[PDB]
Amino acid sequence: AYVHTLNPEATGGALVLVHPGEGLALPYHGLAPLLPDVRLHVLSDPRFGQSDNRFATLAEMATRYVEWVRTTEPEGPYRLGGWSFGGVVALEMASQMTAHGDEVSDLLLVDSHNLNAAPRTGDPREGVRQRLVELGVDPDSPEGVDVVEELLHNGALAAQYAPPAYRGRVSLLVTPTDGDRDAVRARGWDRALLPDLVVEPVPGAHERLFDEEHLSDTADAIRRALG
Ligand SMILES: *P(=O)(O)[C@@H](c1ccc(O)cc1)N1C[C@H](NC(=O)[C@H](N)c2ccc(O)cc2)C1=O
Ligand SMILES: [Ca+2]
Ligand SMILES: [Ca+2]
């Protein structure tokens, strides 16, 4: 229902990708022909479009998703990741799974930020609406209403989540936006939290990484990070 598998007959490995802040794993579908020999398990938010029975914490969402992953891929080692918010969820999943004794060989953070380290800007909903308008999404259409609520709830879960230290291998893919700024620190991470980290550049803007025109570069960055 909310777990979809692309390239299900592939024999080259498996990757689990968690939806970004807008709640749907649809942007990952374009990866299938670029990673045709990787089974891609893509998770969407089962509460998308609902106002009730929301997750109370990011850790609860991660726990549900770990159950899904274990049903889909009962044997490790596991490779987990996600774009933006999805990466943060993947981190918590990896943490939980590694504490239970599962092997997580790769954690993929595609331009993920740690908003728990960030200052409160302005009104949260006003900010989400303004950003959606800038992205050409109508915030008062029905789809827009669902997406606004999704971004609001996932952003608040992320801001509440204080990430743990994670000792497994982590790949952080970063857009070319930092310059002399440290790319790890600028996203609210540090090497005490992520001691085994490789930073991979990926071209394009945060929002456009899974556009058709960027998918090939992004897939190359993913492939390099995984091997
Ligand atoms: P991502 O899934 O796109 C991630 C994100 C986007 C851009 C950044 O610079 C950093 C992270 N997103 C989208 C989602 N929601 C928000 O970021 C909201 N602005 C938000 C944030 C925090 C609260 O409390 C409420 C709303 C998120 O985490
Ligand atoms: Ca408001
Ligand atoms: Ca290219």
Author numbering: 1696 to 1922
The article reads:
The NRPS enzymes that produce the β-lactam antibiotic nocardicin A (1) exhibit several unusual features. In contrast, NocTE is a unique example where a thioesterase domain catalyzes a functionally unidirectional L → D epimerization that expands the known repertoire in nature to achieve this simple but powerful modification. The overall structure of NocTE is similar to known TE domain structures of NRPS and polyketide synthase (PKS) enzymes. The NocTE active site structure with its catalytic triad Ser1779, His1901, and Asp1806 is similar to canonical Type-I thioesterase domains.
We have, therefore, designed and prepared a fluorophosphonate (FP, 4) analog of nocardicin G that captures an accurate substrate acyl-enzyme mimic of the final tetrahedral transition state leading to product release and provides an intimate view of the complete peptide substrate not previously observed in an NRPS TE domain active site. We, therefore, identified new crystal growth conditions of the covalently modified NocTE accessed by preincubation with FP 4. The covalently modified NocTE crystallized in space group P212121 with four protein chains in the asymmetric unit. The structure of NocTE bound to ligand showed excellent density for the covalent modification of Ser1779 in all four chains. The density was unequivocal for the complete ligand in chains A and B. Electron density was of lower quality in chains C and D. A glycerol molecule from the cryoprotection solution is located between the phosphonate moiety and bulk solvent in three chains. No density was observed in any of the four chains for a methyl group attached to the phosphonate of the ligand, likely owing to hydrolysis, or well-precedented “aging”, during the extended period of crystal growth. The NocTE-complex structure with the “aged” phosphonate–Ser adduct (loss of methanol) mimics closely the tetrahedral covalent intermediate of the hydrolysis half-reaction. The N-terminal Hpg group sits in a hydrophobic groove formed by Pro1819, Val1823, Leu1847, Gly1850, and Ala1854. The planar β-lactam ring is positioned at the center of the active site cavity and makes hydrophobic interaction through Cβ with Leu1846 and Gly1716. The His1808 side chain has fully rotated away from the active site to accommodate positioning of the C-terminal Hpg group. The backbone amides of Gly1716 and Phe1780 are in hydrogen bonding distances of 2.7 and 2.9 Å to one phospho-oxygen of the ligand and form the oxyanion hole. Catalytic His1901 is positioned to hydrogen bond with the second phospho-oxygen group, indicating that this oxygen may mimic the attacking water molecule in the post-epimerization hydrolysis reaction (see below).
